Every structure is written in C-alpha cells, then in structure tokens.
Amino acid sequence: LVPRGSHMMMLAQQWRDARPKVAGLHLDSGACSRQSFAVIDATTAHARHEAEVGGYVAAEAATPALDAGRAAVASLIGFAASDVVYTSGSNHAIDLLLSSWPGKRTLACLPGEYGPNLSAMAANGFQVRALPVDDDGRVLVDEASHELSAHPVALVHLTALASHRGIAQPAAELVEACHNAGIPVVIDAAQALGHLDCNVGADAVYSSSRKWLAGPRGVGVLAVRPELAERLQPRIPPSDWPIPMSVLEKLELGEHNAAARVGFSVAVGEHLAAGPTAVRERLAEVGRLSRQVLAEVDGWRVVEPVDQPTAITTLESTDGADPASVRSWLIAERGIVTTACELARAPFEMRTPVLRISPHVDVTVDELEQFAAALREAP
Amino acid sequence: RGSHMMMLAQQWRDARPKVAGLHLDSGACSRQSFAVIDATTAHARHEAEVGGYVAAEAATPALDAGRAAVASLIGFAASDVVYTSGSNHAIDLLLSSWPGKRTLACLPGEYGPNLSAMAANGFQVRALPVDDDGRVLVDEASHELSAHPVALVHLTALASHRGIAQPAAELVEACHNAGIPVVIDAAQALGHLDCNVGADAVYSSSRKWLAGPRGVGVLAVRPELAERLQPRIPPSDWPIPMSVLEKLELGEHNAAARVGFSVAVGEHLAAGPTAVRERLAEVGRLSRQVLAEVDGWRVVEPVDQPTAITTLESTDGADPASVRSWLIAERGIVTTACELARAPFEMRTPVLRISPHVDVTVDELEQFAAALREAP
Ligand SMILES: *Cc1c(COP(=O)(O)O)cnc(C)c1O
Ligand SMILES: *Cc1c(COP(=O)(O)O)cnc(C)c1O
C-alpha cells in the first residue's frame, strides 16, 4: 500500500462533455447516471415523431434502433439479440422470470441478495437458500459447487455486483460450477452490465438502463437462452391463450415508454463505441482511486478491498452517524450526490447501513478529495 | 349543421407538432403538445444536472398536481391516485390485490386483455345484460346482481372497439344498492366522458385522449377499498411499513413521462373538460354523418353517441388491418384495425376505427371518406 496516481484516459473527458453539465458533484451513477445529449435528443425525437405519424407507426419505424439495442445487450452477455426483451427495469425483469418459472420453485442465492429481489422470490413462492461466502460476501465457488451437487436447487440466482457493496463476484466460475450440477443460472446485472464482463455463460441476465449504461429511466432488459425461454410459463396471458405467440413475446407485452427504449439503444450504442473493456478498466480504476482517497477519513471506514474491479465504494460510519442524513446534508449544503444504503437493501448481510459512492469514468482525484473534504466537515 | 367554429380545436392543433398527413387515431396514441414534450425533455436534463432521485423529489409538486387533476375528473381525492405504466398494469395491480372470493360481472364487450388479466388472477366472470349496441341495461343488471351477487363489477365506460357511452353513473348507483363495488376501465373515457360517477376504482392511460406521454397510467382506489387490498409484491407477511397505494406504485418508471402527463392533464383542465367533451361528441356526429354513405362499409355507432369513436364494418368482406396499412402507406391517414381478440365475446367481425381529437374538420372527414372508397 504505496499510493498510485490516476491513469489519464481521454474517455473520462469525452464522457463528461457528451452529457449535461453537473450543478454540483454527482457520485451516484449506481442509482441513476446521466443521459448524454444524444440519448436525451433521441428520446425527444421519438416523442415528436409520435405526434407527426402516430404512436404505433413511429414505434414500428423505430424497430431498427430497438433491435440494435437488443443486439448490443446480447453482445455484452454473449446471448443472441432475439433472446433479449425490454422491461421497466430489473425488478420487472426478476418478477417476469420467477412468475413464469415451471415446476419446483427452489433457488439458492447470496446472503447479500438485493432485498426487493428476496421480496420478488418469496412473492413467486420460491424457497430461497444462501450460498457459502467469505467475510466480504463473495461466493466460495469450490464449496458452492460441492453444496449444489449434494443438495441441488431448480435455479441459482447471482447478483454479480450488489447494490450495497462493490465486490465483483466470480460470475463465470460460479456459472460452470452450477452447469456442472445441471442447474441453470440467472444473473442480476443491474450494477454489473457496463461495469463487469457479463459474458459468463448464464441462462438468463437482466439489467436496468439508468445505471452504468446511462440510459433513460423506466427501461430494463431481460435475456433468456431459448432452451430456458420455451420451458417458461408466463402468468399473462394464461396458458390457455387463444392468442398465439412465443414466451419472450408475452414477457415483452404491455404499454411502455417507446421513446425511452430508443433512448436506451443509443446509450448501449455509446458503451460499445467507447469500448467495453476500456470503460471497465477505468471503473475498476475509479474504485481504487476512491478507496485510496477515503482510506483515512475520521469516523468512516472503506468496506471494499482497495483493488476490487468496481466503481462502487461504501463507507460504514465508525461513530454511528446515519448515512441518510449525511446524504441529505451533502446534497443541501455541498451539491454532492451519493446513496445511503439502508439494511433493507440486503437484510441477510448488512448489520449496519453504509454511505455509497458510485462515480462514472469522468470523476477526478480532485473531486474525490473534495468528497473526502466535505465528508469531514459533516455535522 | 356541423360547421361549428370552435377556437379550442384550433388552439389544440397549433399547441402540437404538424401531422404529416391525417391523424384519426387519438384512441390508440394521440399527439403530445410542445409543452408536454418540453417538460419531459427538461426532467431528463434535470436528472443529469442534480441526479435522478433528487430530480424526482424536486418534481413532486408537478406529480401531485397530476394526481389532483385526475382526482377532480373522477371525483376522488389526490391521495387516492397512483401512477402506473398504463391501463392493463392498473387492472392487474387491482385484481392481483383483490381479497376474498374473486367473482366479477362485466360486459360481453370487455377488453380482450382485461379478460386476460381477470382469468390470470383466478376471477370467475359473468356477462352483464346489454342492448343490441352492447350498452348495459341498468334495471336488468340490478335484478341480476341482487339474485346472484358478485365481489365486483368491472365496467369499461368506453370500449376500444366501439364508441358507445356506457351509463356509468346509473350502473354505479345500482351496483352500490346491491352492495357491490364498481371498477371502471376509463382508458378511453378519461378526457372524453364525464368520469365523475362515484366509482370505487378508476384507471386510465396517458397517451389517449389526454395526449400525455406513453408508459404512464393512473389507478384511483377509494380509501375504504384500498386498505382491504392485499398486494402480490411485497408479500402480505413482510415487514416494510408502506400503505397499499404505496405498494401498488412501487417500481422503476420513467419519471420524466409522469411530469409530462401532469402537464397533459393540466392542459385538459385549462381548456375546460366540459368544452373538450362537447367537442369530442360533435366530432363523433360529423364522423358518423360524413360516413353514412360509403359503399363497402356501415357505421356501427348510433349518430347521437357523445363519443369521437366511430367504427366501420366492411359489407363485402374487406380486412380492416390491410385497409389501415394501405391508408397509411398510400394516403398518410392513421386509423386502428380492431381484431376479434379486442372484444372476443361481442365482436363477430373485425372493424376499422377512427378516433379523431377536437381538431378534425368536415374537410378531413370527407378526405377520409374519399380515400376509403378508392381502397384496393
Ligand atoms: C437497482 C438495482 C435493482 C433494481 O433495478 P430497478 O431497475 O430499480 O428494478 C436490482 N438489483 C440491483 C443490484 C440494483 O442495483
Ligand atoms: C388501450 C386500452 C386499454 C389498455 O391501455 P394500456 O395503457 O395499453 O394498458 C384498456 N382499455 C381500453 C378501453 C383501451 O382502449
């Protein structure tokens, strides 16, 4: 632990200048990032085009953008474009899948599982088991492998990057371990897509638009491999469906903001254009730099090991400060945007709430130091 | 008569982008005004300036104003109103939440996907008595409901497939007498019929007569009913302290599109709801008149229906879907082809639907008439 300086990458700056100017300081891209000028205009145009030719004729004519969106998502998760369906977001995604799941509804997940995920699982009548993990919450693959062969489950659900902690989970090696026990794997990549290599052999993946891909709100994607999609049994319409259509078509049924979906196609486009590997290398670096700067703040400890290939850093208060009030103070008084993660976010891992830092590629050591600074004079 | 000069229609046309050709499809997706589009773009910009959720917090006055405009149109309270992805999301939220015996009466012309959601939620469905136009007979229904009660009545006050205006008010007071609550599907009716009729729950879609952004709906539930409801998610035996209506409104959504919608309802109250309805009723009359005389097509709706939905049944076996494509590709005229799946227990034969807003002229209706006769 001899501190290392920031790599200079023109990517940081290109990204800052393709997006509206921040009013204060935004360290919250793990909750809602920032839409590029291009993503904002593309959304606005679809809405204008709806007024000039009609909503549904506009939507039919947007099919090339929407399909490019599915193909971009597909290229990142190593699926096909036609395995990929649109969604309101990741919780819409997990519900559509678990609500559709045929036969014995039993699953194993991390104890650090997202609280609204556990909520969906139980609401769809799943039995949920914890997988073995280390002191950080990172799955033990050897043991998880032994556990799954002896005591199988109908599906393992893996959140490859938790909303509440910047540990990158060994997604790929867990997936072969599960396939080695004949068990499918669903990945919650709400935080992982556009941040971690999500090309790991998974049977289903879902993510949200508004996070690291910097898409509009109200959009997610759900990808299912065709072996698994055909076995699925959607809730709407009912199985006796006079209307005939595939599973993915049923799962994609419903009114949605189509402008936001073309918005989202542009934003995935921008991530491919920037280079997925370069953007991931830089986010790993943002995490490191973030943990270097915050290593010595009195009243706060850094939770993540320093070199986790992630941009998510979490601070547990060492004198029982309430992250929520520190967050409200940092906004009202310093224009700095963070997230306070309550216990409810991962009720089977978190003993104490945490303040979360999730900057995108455009953050500077200067700005991290300014956050460090503001965090010290908090009342 | 019909040469009414109405300034509302002209302001409404000029408040909005220029339609390429002719748009007679406001029952499927209307046209957002420059203000609604601007308000949506501005919320997305603000998210980028101050962060998504701090922007959503700042937007509360506009969001609540939206709930409160909706409340004034249906005679509910703002705090009874909850946002939704649209109307099918609404009905699913309400029926999946329904406690005790799941039994229900509705019209034989019920929305296909409404019946889909009813069946998916383990409801038994009985048909309500109706005349030849599929219009509920309220007295019959009263007797019917006394003799065989039902947990709730689901009235679609205006159908997607036909411009009949259902006697919502009188039906509500009859169901209420039999002690049975009434849910109204008002996706077509909100901004169109008077929807202040004492219903127990009402829902609607942003993109139709209110000309709001797509991806938004409203679901209003009276407090007496709301607190008896048992949402699917989170499960009823969980320890997060939220009200039922907070549970039904949980979830990733396009917040920009909701402030857009609040501007759209705003523009409807500003224009004067009564004046906008009297004018939609007029547009229906002119439509059914100008189209009374068209080889290959009979007008389905009595001329006097207070509605801008007129539907056309082909007399010589044309497929409305192809006529709609032809009309778009070859005349730039937008319409909707209603298939049987839209009302599977009322429709024997599919129909072509026009749903023009307040801004259509006798001229444009004659052009549509003309284009319809030279249709290969
Ligand atoms: C944000 C998030 C979700 C939920 O995404 P929505 O789009 O809000 O439904 C699920 N899992 C993780 C890890 C998240 O960060
Ligand atoms: C369009 C429509 C619906 C469903 O609206 P969505 O917003 O697409 O869910 C329901 N009822 C009627 C009468 C409709 O016209």
Numbering used by the authors:
A (entry chain A): -7 to 371
B (entry chain C): -4 to 371
Which sentences from the paper describe this structure?
One of the key steps in the ergothioneine-biosynthesis pathway, the C-S bond cleavage reaction, uses the pyridoxal 5′-phosphate dependent C-S lyase to produce the final product L-ergothioneine. EgtE and Egt2 are PLP-dependent C-S lyases in EGT biosynthesis, leading to the conversion from sulfoxide 4 to EGT. Each MsEgtE monomer has 15 α-helices and 11 β-strands and is classified into three domains based on the domain assignments of NcEgt2.
Because of the fast catalytic turnover of the enzyme in the substrate as described in NcEgt2 (32), it is hard to obtain MsEgtE–substrate complex by co-crystallization. Based on the catalytic mechanism of the NcEgt2 enzyme, we found that pyruvate, one of the products in the catalytic reaction, fits well into the electron density map. The complex of MsEgtE-PLP binding to pyruvate is constructed by a homotetramer composed of two homodimers with two PLP cofactors located close to their respective subunits, and pyruvate interacted with the interface of the A/C subunit. Specifically, pyruvate forms salt bridges with Arg348 and Arg337, and also binds to Gln183 through a hydrogen bond. Besides, the carboxyl group of pyruvate creates hydrogen bonds with Tyr48′ of another monomer and water molecule. Tyr48 on α3 of MsEgtE, occupying a spatial position similar to the Phe48 in NcEgt2, participates in pyruvate production with the same function as Arg75 from α3 in NcEgt2.
